[PDB]
Ligand binder design. Structure first.
Ligand code: NA
Length: 129
C-alpha cells in the first residue's frame, strides 16, 4: 500500500507515534517519506546481507527474521514480511522498540540525514488530525 502523506500521519497518530519518546508526528512522517516513499512494500538489501523492510525500513540484522540473515536477531519477534502489510501495526510496534533502545530516531539513517533539525512539522501541514 502506498499511503498518502496525511493518511499515514493519521494512521501513525492513531497507533500512538505522535510524540512517542518525544518525537513529534512530523518526524515519523518525514522518516517514512525518505525511507520508503510511504510504500509499505518497500524492501532494500544492505551491504552486510541484511534487508530493510516496510514504511520505516526496519532491518533484519536486529529486528525481524527473514530466513536469510545469518547471525542476526529478531528483537521484534516477527517475520520481516509482517512489516510489508497494508496494516502498519507491526511496523509501528517494532519502531517503538527501536526508538526506545538508546539511540532514538538516529537508528534511521534517512531521519538522521534528511529530517533531523529540519522543519518536520511541514510534513503534517494541512492534515486533519
Ligand atoms: Na533477523
Amino acid at each position: 500500500k502506498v499511503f498518502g502523506r496525511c493518511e499515514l500521519a493519521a494512521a501513525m497518530k492513531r497507533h500512538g507515534l505522535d510524540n512517542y519518546r518525544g518525537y513529534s508526528l512530523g518526524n515519523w512522517v518525514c522518516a517514512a517519506k525518505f525511507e520508503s516513499n510511504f510504500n509499505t512494500q518497500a524492501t532494500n538489501r544492505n551491504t552486510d546481507g541484511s534487508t530493510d523492510y516496510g514504511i520505516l525500513q526496519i532491518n533484519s540484522r536486529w529486528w525481524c527474521n527473514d530466513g536469510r540473515t545469518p547471525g542476526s536477531r529478531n528483537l521484534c519477534n516477527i517475520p520481516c514480511s509482517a512489516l510489508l502489510s497494508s496494516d502498519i501495526t507491526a511496523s509501528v510496534n517494532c519502531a517503538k522498540k527501536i526508538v526506545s533502545d538508546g539511540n532514538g530516531m538516529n537508528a534511521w539513517v534517512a531521519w538522521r540525514n534528511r529530517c533531523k533539525g529540519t522543519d518536520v512539522q511541514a510534513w503534517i501541514r494541512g492534515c486533519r488530525l
